[PDB]
């Protein structure tokens, strides 16, 4: 009737990517955006924004019917699993996402390293002259476990298609693992690794099965 | 047309003092004054009250119930070697400053106080007789004029003093005195006819303490709310260009309420001290009459800003009544003056707090819209109106008109014609054509010089705009490669001010430092530094100023001239003060497209951040760079960030590889402490290494002094975060 | 009589437009969110006839920090105490810092009545972040988020019951305020039995300088009644509705109500407004129960 399933998974960074976060004031030794931090503390963190904005858009080019144009109308099929403010038939997101935090400094000040993020130098060729606009980027550092719970209700119609939505999240994590996910991912910075994709239940309402 | 004249009487009561001093003359100056108006002036009721301005001199009696009575007892009030400094008698002993007579212009270079003058008195002067003479052949004047005269009384006399004798009755001006003496010569006539008697205006008051001690007088004040909650909140980002028209509605707002009020009851404009930034100090008289009027004032101007605005906007009155005894005298206890204001500005804060009652509250809850479209700009959907993207509603729709009208040099008052800004009247922008022109009209900045057959009454405000709002991205960048698209925005805001307005100019027994005229010339005085010569400093530059009042400002535009033009206005202003008067403020860089809300607000933040440690404090660009301002234009501005500019700038592209190491060591402090001294000397030898064999000579003593100021002192290191900071954002890209 | 602390982490709750934010939030906020899932799981007709009980109440969100924190008094103290007199300047800058305070501590209810100034505790810091749009001509917006710290808690008192239980053991895993469509509400509930042997003065009956809460609203029969001679400060709080059959989504009016702390003189009586602006099949309901303390 009401069950609560939450993926619970480590994210694996298993290439440095680069986010721009907000103003430079917590990372102000580079050039262009830096990557967003904590304000409290300095652990580089991803907010969950760019999780919905980057994996609904890989996913309504492969289970769409008709070319889309403008977000919340493109594949209804879909549609009730992020949001639209046009369809009366569901408004509310039923996937809940989370801001994966850096879960890893608990083991990496005993191997010492150099910080949380390197900087890395840059530039382009005008096919005219030498070195232009040499500028730097601030990359992400290799082998950084993360938090990302993946929430999960039904709402009592959800009944006679439950089984064919576990399809579309399953498909969509793997899917994920083979693009880039961050910027300027077109020469290989992204690319992350779901470990240990678990799923279990917290209110308890609906067996497990399904795990994989 | 009876009552009119004992305004008049008043303010030229001592117009023979400036030909005394100019021309050389035995004659006294209530004696000389009367003969010299009568000769170009056919008067008579006028001129006697100037020949009886004194008490030793009674020509031969001439009147019973005369208007010349009541001029003695006004003129002590306002009372109490060339022109004694204001804030000199403000704290303790420092430097002993004076002025110079010159003239009042906002185009003219200011004249700061210093000790190079002349200490003896004025001299022979011929600057300041001949424009007074020159613009004196005047009609009668009636009620068709008002402040037709007053505008210009103060905008060349205010370097001129009145009666120069001792040092206690000396830093008071001319153009003050003779304006702040008329406003308790009106409350002496209110309060003589309210009551019943007459044939006291003679000579009856035969103790020293007899009228003194009866209270005849009235101290009102509010407290306009919804300043900085109307103008810096907004929606989105596209009323950036009408932000400049919106600081503009609620300037004329705050004078409109003194407009109203005092013409209402019968009074002029010396019943004012100090209009703007929702803050003032009216006085009135101790009468039935007076009281009635204000009650119901407050309750029908409220009344429409209920229906076209919401509980935003909110005016709450303070009255409080006191004694004349208070300021003269004896009684020269702080706690005697202060409690003056204690009787008005207590309800002030209770006011506030209880504003709506009964058959009001329900009215805002009863319930009859029903549609979705909004302007998208205040949050108000009441009669609507196609523009252009979106609907701007009416609240922000007449902004849109009057942004264009702020090149108009006049502003017409209408009844409806526009945007309507009272009970029954408007406000427009027009000028050289004059359609109509109902009454009261106000211009902006308008001293001197240009100067003709105009009639209106206006103050003073600050106005300056350099090329629109929403595009000073492209004139931060030069034109070969320096610079970001991005802009800064600085609140300048005054720190202390419960001192040297209440109780701060006690230093001395003898006199009783507790005048009200002493007290009203610290507003006048901080008023032109702060609303009249912020346009004349913030000149040749990319910035555009908003909301120049006398407490917060915002100053909005590129940072290529505001970082230097907030240090540079507090220099301006320690010589003004000798030194007695901290200030802060906040700098802080913002991205391009964003919305004024956050933008406004998250730079005020670092105002009340700024004084965790005292108060002569300030806050960079973030909430840690915690300094004491007089250390930024001594040592980083100094010697620091300026260093840079001339030994380093030889080296480019490969030398510009050090930089943003260097600052990540000087954050990383408190777990790694001596480690991280030991990693500072390996980057110092890079640098040296890795250039020209002919250019080591220039790079020499930047090694040694980087060195000594990482391990010197803690605050210390906070200051070569700053300069490394500014270095990289002047050129770059 | 029983409070439910949760904590939060990297939060949104807006106060007029979507790009502020505060660091508390209304109470018109939790009673709004417990009665729209109520649909969803299948029992919102059993809820309705709880609210309307008089004795289930709400409580607005409070600091906890090693202790439960309290709003500080409206217009208390009076003219009376000055709290070491020694100059004009120094009595006037202090006078500032309560009113910017935002909570007081539970030990502190008593001496802040005979005297006592002092800055509030910094609970946390207010951090914006940034989003855009790549294809959509690279428009972009900005919204702030609420990222506590040093240990900042909140605690909501209710009543105990079979049923309050099960309904907010799922709001924790479904967001509250703020961007929901993201994660800017998740916390972790933590129960417990005994509150505490000194905030147990929540009294509805007797009139001893009581202090209304959460945002209260009188009624059409006692109104000026008890609004003279009192403390208050009117604040705004509404938006567009969220509905699932409109095809529009009314604007919901305007109910200015009080603010969190504010001193009155009687007991009020507590009512549930219906915000209807055109048609619904529904009805927006409200909170509108303010509590008092015997302070
Ligand atoms: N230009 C001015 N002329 C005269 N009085 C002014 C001016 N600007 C502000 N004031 C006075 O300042 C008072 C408000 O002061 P405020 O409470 O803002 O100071 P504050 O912020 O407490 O100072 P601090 O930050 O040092 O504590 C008003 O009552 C007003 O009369």
Redesign the pocket.
């Known amino acids: 009737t009401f069950a609560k399933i939450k993926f619970s998974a480590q994210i694996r960074l298993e290439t440095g990517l680069h986010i721009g976060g907000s103003d430079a004031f917590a990372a102000i030794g580079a050039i262009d955006s830096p990557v967003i931090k904590d304000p409290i503390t300095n652990i580089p963190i991803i907010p969950g924004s760019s999780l919905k904005g980057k994996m609904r858009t890989l996913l309504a080019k492969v289970y769409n019917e008709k070319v889309a144009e403008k977000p919340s109308d493109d594949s209804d099929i879909l549609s009730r699993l992020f949001g639209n403010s046009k369809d009366k038939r569901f408004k509310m997101g039923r996937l809940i996402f989370r801001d994966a935090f850096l879960s890893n400094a608990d083991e990496l000040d005993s191997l010492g390293v150099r910080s949380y993020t390197e900087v890395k130098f840059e530039n382009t060729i005008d096919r005219i002259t030498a070195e232009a606009n040499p500028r730097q980027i601030e990359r992400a550092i290799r082998n950084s476990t993360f938090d990302f719970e993946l929430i999960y209700e039904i709402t009592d119609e959800n009944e006679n298609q439950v089984e064919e939505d576990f399809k579309v999240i399953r498909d969509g994590l793997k899917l994920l693992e083979l693009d880039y996910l961050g910027g300027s991912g077109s020469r290989g910075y992204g690319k992350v690794a779901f470990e240990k994709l678990k799923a279990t239940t917290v209110f308890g309402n609906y067996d497990v099965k399904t795990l994989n | 047309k009876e009552k009119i004249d004992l305004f008049y009487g008043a303010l030229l009561h001592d117009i023979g003092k400036v030909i005394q001093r100019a021309t050389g003359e035995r004659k006294k100056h209530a004696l000389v004054g009367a003969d010299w108006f009568d000769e170009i002036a056919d008067n008579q009721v006028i001129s006697d009250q100037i020949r009886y301005h004194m008490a030793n001199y009674q020509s031969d009696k001439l009147g019973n119930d005369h208007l010349a009575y009541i001029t003695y007892i006004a003129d002590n009030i306002a009372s109490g070697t060339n022109q004694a400094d204001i804030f000199n008698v403000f704290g303790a002993q420092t430097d002993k400053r004076y002025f110079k007579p010159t003239v009042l212009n906002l185009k003219s270079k200011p004249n700061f106080a210093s000790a190079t003058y002349e200490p003896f008195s004025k001299g022979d002067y011929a600057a300041i007789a001949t424009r007074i003479k020159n613009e004196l052949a005047e009609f009668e004047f009636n009620q068709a004029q008002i402040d037709s005269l007053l505008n210009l009384f103060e905008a060349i006399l205010s370097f001129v003093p009145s009666s120069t004798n001792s040092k206690e009755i000396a830093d008071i001006s001319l153009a003050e005195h003779s304006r702040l003496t008329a406003a308790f010569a009106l409350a002496i006539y209110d309060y003589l006819e309210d009551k019943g008697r007459h044939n006291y205006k003679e000579d009856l008051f035969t103790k020293a303490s007899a009228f003194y001690e009866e209270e005849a007088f009235l101290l009102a004040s509010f407290d306009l709310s919804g300043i900085q909650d109307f103008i810096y909140n907004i929606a989105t980002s596209g009323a950036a260009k009408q932000l400049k028209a919106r600081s503009l509605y609620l300037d004329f707002m705050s004078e409109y309420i003194a407009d109203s009020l005092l013409d209402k009851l019968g009074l002029n404009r010396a019943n004012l001290l100090?209009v703007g930034?929702g803050?003032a100090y009216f006085v009135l008289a101790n009468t039935e009459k007076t009281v009635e009027t204000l009650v119901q004032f407050e309750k029908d101007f409220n009344q429409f800003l209920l229906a076209n605005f919401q509980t935003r906007l909110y005016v709450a009155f303070g009255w409080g009544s006191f004694a004349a005894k208070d300021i003269m005298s004896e009684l020269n206890s702080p706690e005697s003056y202060r409690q003056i204001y204690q009787k008005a500005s207590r309800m002030i804060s209770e006011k506030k707090i209880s504003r709506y009652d009964y058959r009001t509250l329900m009215l805002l809850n009863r319930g009859g819209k029903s549609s979705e479209r909004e302007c998208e700009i205040c949050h108000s959907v009441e009669n609507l109106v196609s523009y252009h993207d979106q609907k701007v509603c009416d609240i922000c729709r007449g902004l849109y008109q009057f942004s264009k009208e702020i090149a108009h040099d006049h502003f017409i008052i209408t009844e409806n014609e526009g945007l309507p800004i009272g009970p029954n009247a408007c406000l427009k922008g027009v000028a050289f054509e004059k359609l109509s022109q109902e009454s009261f009209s106000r211009v902006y900045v308008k001293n001197d010089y240009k100067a003709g057959t105009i009639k209106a009454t206006h103050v003073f405000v600050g106005d300056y705009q350099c090329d629109e709002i929403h595009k000073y991205a492209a004139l931060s960048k030069n034109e070969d490669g320096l610079g970001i698209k991005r802009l800064a925005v600085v609140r300048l805001d005054?720190?202390?001010?419960g001192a040297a307005?209440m109780a701060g100019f006690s230093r001395q027994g003898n006199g009783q430092y507790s005048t009200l005229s002493r007290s009203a010339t610290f507003?006048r005085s901080?008023?032109l530094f702060?609303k009249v010569y912020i346009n004349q400093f913030a000149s040749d530059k990319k910035l555009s100023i908003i909301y120049a009042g006398?407490?917060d400002v915002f100053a909005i535009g590129s940072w290529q001239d505001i970082i230097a033009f907030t240090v540079e206005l507090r220099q301006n202003f320690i010589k003004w003060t000798n030194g007695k008067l901290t200030l802060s403020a906040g700098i802080g860089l913002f991205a391009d497209k964003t919305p004024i809300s956050l933008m406004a607000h998250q730079t005020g933040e670092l105002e009340e951040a700024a004084?965790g440690n005292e108060?002569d404090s300030i806050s960079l660009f973030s909430s840690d760079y915690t300094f004491k301002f007089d250390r930024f234009i001594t040592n980083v501005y100094d010697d620091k960030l300026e260093q840079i500019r001339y030994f380093f700038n030889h080296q480019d592209e490969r030398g510009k590889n050090f930089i943003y190491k260097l600052i990540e060591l000087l954050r990383n402090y408190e777990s790694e402490e001596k480690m991280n001294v030991a990693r500072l000397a390996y980057y110092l030898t890079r640098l040296e290494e890795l250039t020209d064999k002919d250019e080591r000579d220039k790079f020499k003593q930047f090694k040694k002094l980087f060195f000594k100021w990482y391990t010197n002192n803690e605050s210390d290191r906070k200051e070569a975060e700053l300069a490394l900071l500014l270095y990289v954002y002047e050129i770059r890209k | 009589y029983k409070l439910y602390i949760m904590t939060f982490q990297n939060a949104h709750f807006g106060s007029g437009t979507l790009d502020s934010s505060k660091l508390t939030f209304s109470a018109d906020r939790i009673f709004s969110a417990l009665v729209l899932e109520s649909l969803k799981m299948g029992k919102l007709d059993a809820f309705l006839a709880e609210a309307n009980q008089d004795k289930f109440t709400l409580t607005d969100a409070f600091p906890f920090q090693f202790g439960p924190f309290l709003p500080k008094p409206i217009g208390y103290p009076k003219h009376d105490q000055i709290d070491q007199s020694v100059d004009v300047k120094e009595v006037?800058?202090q006078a500032?810092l309560s009113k910017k305070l935002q909570f007081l501590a539970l030990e502190n209810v008593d001496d802040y009545l005979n005297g006592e100034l002092f800055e509030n505790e910094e609970h946390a810091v207010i951090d914006t972040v940034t989003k855009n749009q790549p294809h959509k001509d690279g428009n972009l917006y900005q919204v702030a988020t609420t990222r506590f710290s040093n240990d900042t808690s909140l605690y909501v008192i209710a009543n105990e019951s079979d049923l309050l239980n099960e309904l907010m053991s799922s709001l924790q895993y479904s967001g509250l305020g703020g961007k929901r469509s993201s994660g800017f509400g998740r916390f972790e509930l933590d129960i417990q039995n005994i509150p505490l042997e000194l905030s147990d003065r929540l009294t509805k009956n007797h009139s001893d300088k009581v202090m209304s809460l959460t945002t209260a609203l009188p009624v059409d029969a006692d109104l000026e009644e008890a609004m003279e001679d009192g403390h208050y400060l009117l604040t705004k709080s509404s938006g567009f509705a969220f509905s699932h059959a409109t095809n529009e989504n009314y604007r919901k009016q305007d109910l200015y109500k009080f603010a969190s702390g504010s001193t009155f003189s009687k007991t009020f009586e507590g009512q549930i407004v219906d915000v209807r602006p055109l048609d619904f099949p529904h009805a927006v309901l409200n909170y509108a129960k303010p509590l008092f303390f015997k302070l």
């Open positions: 100090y930034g803050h005054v720190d202390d001010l307005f507003s901080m008023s702060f006398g407490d004084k108060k | 006037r800058r500032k």
